[PDB]
Design a protein around this nucleic acid. Sequence first.
RNA 1: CGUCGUCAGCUCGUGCCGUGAGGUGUUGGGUUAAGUCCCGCAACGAGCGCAACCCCCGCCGUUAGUUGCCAGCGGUUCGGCCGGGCACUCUAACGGGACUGCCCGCGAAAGCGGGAGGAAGGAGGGGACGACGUCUGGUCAGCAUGGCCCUUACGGCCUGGGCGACACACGUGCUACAAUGCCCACUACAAAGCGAUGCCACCCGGCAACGGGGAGCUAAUCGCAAAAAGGUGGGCCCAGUUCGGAUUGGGGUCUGCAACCCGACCCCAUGAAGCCGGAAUCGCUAGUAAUCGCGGAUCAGCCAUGCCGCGGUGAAUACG
RNA 2: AAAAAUGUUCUAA
Lengths: 83, 23, 60, 206, 18, 97, 127, 63, 155
Amino acid sequence: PRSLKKGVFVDDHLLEKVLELNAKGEKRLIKTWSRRSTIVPEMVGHTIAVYNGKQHVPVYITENMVGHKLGEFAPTRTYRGHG
Amino acid sequence: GKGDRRTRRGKIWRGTYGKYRPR
Amino acid sequence: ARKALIEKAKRTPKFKVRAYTRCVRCGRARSVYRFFGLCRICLRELAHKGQLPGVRKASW
Amino acid sequence: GNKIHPIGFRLGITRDWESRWYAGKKQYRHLLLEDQRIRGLLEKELYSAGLARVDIERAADNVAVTVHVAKPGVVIGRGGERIRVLREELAKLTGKNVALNVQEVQNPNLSAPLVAQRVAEQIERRFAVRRAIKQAVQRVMESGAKGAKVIVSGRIGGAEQARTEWAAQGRVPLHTLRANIDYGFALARTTYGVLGVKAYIFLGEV
Amino acid sequence: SKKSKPGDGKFGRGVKRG
Amino acid sequence: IRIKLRGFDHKTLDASAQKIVEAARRSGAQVSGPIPLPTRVRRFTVIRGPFKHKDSREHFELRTHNRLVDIINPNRKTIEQLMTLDLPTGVEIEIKT
Amino acid sequence: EQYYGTGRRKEAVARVFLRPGNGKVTVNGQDFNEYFQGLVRAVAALEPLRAVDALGHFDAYITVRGGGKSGQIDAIKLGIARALVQYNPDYRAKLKPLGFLTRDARVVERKKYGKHKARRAPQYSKR
Amino acid sequence: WKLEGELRAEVAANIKRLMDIGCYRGLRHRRGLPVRGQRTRTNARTRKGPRKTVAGKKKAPRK
Amino acid sequence: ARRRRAEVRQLQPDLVYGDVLVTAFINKIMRDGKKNLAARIFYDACKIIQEKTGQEPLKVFKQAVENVKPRMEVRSRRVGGANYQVPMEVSPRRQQSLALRWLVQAANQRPERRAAVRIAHELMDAAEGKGGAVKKKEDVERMAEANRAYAHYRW
RNA sequence: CGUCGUCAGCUCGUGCCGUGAGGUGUUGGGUUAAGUCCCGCAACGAGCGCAACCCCCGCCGUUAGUUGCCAGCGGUUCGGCCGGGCACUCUAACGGGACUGCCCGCGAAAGCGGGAGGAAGGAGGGGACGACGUCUGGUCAGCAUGGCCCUUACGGCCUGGGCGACACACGUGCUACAAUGCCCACUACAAAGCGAUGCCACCCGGCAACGGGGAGCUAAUCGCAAAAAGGUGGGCCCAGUUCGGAUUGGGGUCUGCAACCCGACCCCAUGAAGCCGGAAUCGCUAGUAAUCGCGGAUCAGCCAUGCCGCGGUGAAUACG
RNA sequence: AAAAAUGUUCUAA
Ligand SMILES: [Mg+2]
Ligand SMILES: [Mg+2]
Ligand SMILES: [Mg+2]
Ligand SMILES: [Mg+2]
Ligand SMILES: [Mg+2]
Ligand SMILES: [Mg+2]
Ligand SMILES: [Mg+2]
Ligand SMILES: [Mg+2]
Ligand SMILES: [Mg+2]
Ligand SMILES: [Mg+2]
Ligand SMILES: [Mg+2]
Ligand SMILES: [Mg+2]
Ligand SMILES: [Mg+2]
Ligand SMILES: [Mg+2]
Ligand SMILES: [Mg+2]
Ligand SMILES: [Mg+2]
Ligand SMILES: [Mg+2]
Ligand SMILES: [Mg+2]
Ligand SMILES: [Mg+2]
Ligand SMILES: [Mg+2]
Ligand SMILES: [Mg+2]
Ligand SMILES: [Mg+2]
Ligand SMILES: [Mg+2]
Ligand SMILES: [Mg+2]
Ligand SMILES: [Mg+2]
Ligand SMILES: [Mg+2]
Ligand SMILES: [Mg+2]
Ligand SMILES: [Mg+2]
Ligand SMILES: [Mg+2]
Ligand SMILES: [Mg+2]
Ligand SMILES: [Mg+2]
Ligand SMILES: [Mg+2]
Ligand SMILES: [Mg+2]
Ligand SMILES: [Mg+2]
Ligand SMILES: [Mg+2]
Ligand SMILES: [Mg+2]
Ligand SMILES: [Mg+2]
Ligand SMILES: [Mg+2]
Ligand SMILES: [Mg+2]
Ligand SMILES: [Mg+2]
Ligand SMILES: [Mg+2]
Ligand SMILES: [Mg+2]
Ligand SMILES: [Mg+2]
Ligand SMILES: [Mg+2]
Ligand SMILES: [Mg+2]
Ligand SMILES: [Mg+2]
Ligand SMILES: [Mg+2]
Ligand SMILES: [Zn+2]
């Protein structure tokens, strides 16, 4: 995992979109393409529309999904089996 | 064996070092 | 997707990691030798002409 | 498809490189690019003169291109004034002092690259492709050559079914290294597609 | 009816779009 | 007072070694005869075909030959004279103290 | 004083100096039996001077570099075998009929492209 | 350190946690597939189980 | 071989008992080229064979080899399209080979854990007439006496 | 470029035979790795092939003597370290050396068996080298290129996704199932290569991956570097184990704008199948197979157990 | 002195 000597990664353009929302009494529905961004405690209780390559999956954000990237919650392969 | 990272044998294989094979 | 990718590899990128070699002769992305700036094919073409200083079909 | 290029096979024994210089790992390639770039200019411009071999010599920030053209009058121009227009235009991409010699051709019918280019020309000019092979190989042998071979491939006569036509006189020991074999290639463009012209001259053994 | 293989049902042309 | 020569063709290297060592021997005296250092080979292995015929390659090497030569007693009638020599093109010289 | 012989086997080169004395054999400053401890093919390097009864007559000061202990062993056998006949040549007879005067040029065959090894070829399956 | 039965329970709560949030590693625990990026086209029998062989596409007959 | 007979390699006599049959044997003990290992194991069993049944090892070896040398064996033939079991007599060279081969194989069958003990024990039994390697030799000879009916098919 | 196949073959000029296709020569006896060579002959020659000339390895000479080497004397903090020296080792160019040259035996000859000298003997080992052709073999996606087709789109930029999917099936491989083994400590011996936003000595922090300092090296000098199997010594005691190291939990490191999909590595924990594999099936004739480790191209990193090389140890067997 | 059947249509470059 990312060297903790370095930061904790958020694209800085998705974070701004949040803090603003925090300020003015959020929540708008947040869409973004930063699957690599980490779920940060400021985000908890928003819902971020994450891109799966095709669509913006809407994702609610709770205290227990905080160590993660947002891409973890919008899978990219639609499988449903063989048969 | 060579697949055992936790031995002087497995570090010789993966060409790495560590506690189990220092330098 | 050929010529616009000949150009793009020349352009200095938005990030260091996006740099990549291309054959300077034919444009090939794969099998590009740093020493020559050439893919493994053009290498074998220019070699057999003797247009490559000191290069000689090895044997041993 | 099997056979080895007969010049790349003789490099060091019967054949010298078209580029002579040492350069270190750090700037070999950049010299090679100019080298390739240079020849492009001159094969592009001095084709009409009957270009045969671009020797490129380097010492340090001064490069020594040497053309081997059949009719050098087409190169020099109005008394050094065409040579000049390119002795300059060479430095325009060279950046170095581009010293440009022109060398006579001993006998053009002994320069495989030329035989090719001339047969290639004739088949680009709608002649009988079989005839041109038997004619070129005749001219070479008359010139004391100890053997000569010419090979055409593609849509001969625009025949849909591509073919291979060749003819050979004297002897051409391709498996021999001490045999001096001038080998050249020419490419023949036509309205129906492309044809490849290969010329082998046995100049004799050493 | 576009670029390469597989074919999109038009002669010569395939399903891939640009 | 030392000179080291480099080239891809040993025939040019070995030759200009002798014509150097001799010229200093001309305005001598003491010169340490040309030592052959080990050659540094840069190999290239290439798939013979342009497509898919993996198990058929062809080889290519690049030999950088190495000669070192030592002139012991300078005698500035070669520290002058050497500057005017005849070194072919496939050769580079580094000179040292 | 000394009677020398140069010995080579398989990338291994050995310099043997035959000097008379009690029997002291010595390789790169280490004792012989200390340098080839537990390598059961050690006594082969000495076999030459048994064929000419020189066992205890001599001592031997020896150096080796290259290859491995075994290549160094058959190097030594050849060098001493030549060192010996470079002390008198009449020894050549009765030393040549045991191959002591010859160098086996068995070398590591190079790997060829399209194989895994020199001649071990990749596995076949038709379909 | 913590051990036999308690370690098992903390391991269980972590896996249990991932499937609840619905993350990628959570889904790969639900479907019982590999979790650490292995290929699943042709391997993963530790994770997948014994081979459940099914019929294949038939080669055409001659004639 | 097709064009010409294969030539029998002459091996180097061993450094202890100066014997080539020792070398051939140590060569059969060897896997993965680790000859120094196989030397040890053989020689180590000569310790165990010196102690147990106090006798000269080299002699207990040689006698076990001789007692395993098979003099008969069936080979296959073809006459028409037949898959025969034709009894033939074993060449002295192959005699020695199969015997060395079986000795080792019976050894690794034995139930003792350390190798030289396994060797030393199949070596004593075989110079006395017991032993997996002797069972195999007699088996070979029995089937050859069996199919003596197809002996006129010999070549 | 693949391939038949390094298989021993494919042809031509003139003469002769035949109405003609075609034949002869190239068939025949002997020989050879070989259409290699001998002898025979309505054929006599000639070309493409075979061999040879080229490269590496094996012995010897010359030429050289630093960054390499240390035989013998002088020092020495005991390191070829310093004096010196180039003998040797080596390094890298130029040569010599093997030709069935000699002896015996067979033979018409070519050759064949054997012997001697010799480092090497019957082509010394290996490589490079691939006939006329075959397969409407492969490549329009390396390149080139005729014809067909697209033109605010079948072109071009971007962000994200995918090329990594997984009821299944095959191929080429890695690691094993163990005691001729596994583990810890200590101690030996390579070759070929790579290395100035590179190799990193050495020093401290850290169990470690690493980090921080920090000399030397434009490199026969400095570094990558330790080779590993080996040898010595201890531990395991036949157990799904101190065999095996898959899977999963947790915690880190680094490269990188960025490691969710989808990186390598480190440490704790976990510790699967696997007890030598059905029908069937592959490679190798000697420094080969097997086994051991090392390096390089590509490359920020890396999914390399792949590929191309390198040396260590070193067998079995071929009747036919 | 022979275990063992078969190979869709047009094209042969
Ligand atoms: Mg890149
Ligand atoms: Mg590239
Ligand atoms: Mg038109
Ligand atoms: Mg598809
Ligand atoms: Mg459709
Ligand atoms: Mg596009
Ligand atoms: Mg392969
Ligand atoms: Mg090897
Ligand atoms: Mg295959
Ligand atoms: Mg996957
Ligand atoms: Mg039907
Ligand atoms: Mg035929
Ligand atoms: Mg005729
Ligand atoms: Mg007639
Ligand atoms: Mg005729
Ligand atoms: Mg024929
Ligand atoms: Mg014929
Ligand atoms: Mg005929
Ligand atoms: Mg006939
Ligand atoms: Mg042959
Ligand atoms: Mg005849
Ligand atoms: Mg050498
Ligand atoms: Mg000398
Ligand atoms: Mg040849
Ligand atoms: Mg086709
Ligand atoms: Mg194209
Ligand atoms: Mg096209
Ligand atoms: Mg793929
Ligand atoms: Mg299977
Ligand atoms: Mg693999
Ligand atoms: Mg498999
Ligand atoms: Mg390394
Ligand atoms: Mg278990
Ligand atoms: Mg079980
Ligand atoms: Mg265990
Ligand atoms: Mg273990
Ligand atoms: Mg984890
Ligand atoms: Mg990733
Ligand atoms: Mg067991
Ligand atoms: Mg098995
Ligand atoms: Mg063979
Ligand atoms: Mg192993
Ligand atoms: Mg590697
Ligand atoms: Mg890499
Ligand atoms: Mg992976
Ligand atoms: Mg029948
Ligand atoms: Mg039917
Ligand atoms: Zn290219």
